[PDB]
Design a protein around this ligand. Sequence first.
Ligand SMILES: CC(=O)N[C@@H]1[C@@H](O)[C@H](O[C@@H]2O[C@H](CO)[C@@H](O)[C@H](O)[C@H]2NC(C)=O)[C@@H](CO)O[C@@H]1O
Length: 129
Amino acid sequence: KVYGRCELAAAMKRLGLDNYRGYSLGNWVCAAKFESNFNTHATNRNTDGSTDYGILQINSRWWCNDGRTPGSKNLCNIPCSALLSSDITASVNCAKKIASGGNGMNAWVAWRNRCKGTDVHAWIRGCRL
Ligand SMILES: CC(=O)N[C@@H]1[C@@H](O)[C@H](O[C@@H]2O[C@H](CO)[C@@H](O)[C@H](O)[C@H]2NC(C)=O)[C@@H](CO)O[C@@H]1O
């Protein structure tokens, strides 16, 4: 599924991401935009044999098990296939675990480069939330 911007903002709000660990909702919307262009089927291979899955491009080295990544730690306790669903619940629950690490949302490289420090509140303006 390809989400609309405000469609995604609403879904993320309902799952508890606004002001999670001090990050306002627009951070998460911006991250999803630059990681996947709001496409839940997005995948990218990494050079270490792991793969990034879904709308928030969560990797199979640390976070989910895809069966083909040797030594996956599977810290989110989920198959990576669950991160490709139209329903973003599994991706959001895992994202909260990721964002609880020391470096917070810096774990998302596209957020760090294209979202961090900007007026991310723009990403939810005009949405009914
Ligand atoms: C939260 C999450 O999974 N974010 C992804 C990053 O982990 C990806 O970065 C790549 O991560 C793999 C596995 O740890 C590293 O081997 C690799 O060096 C790293 N690549 C970069 C450029 O840092 C990122 C890839 O675009 O996708 C999400 O941000």
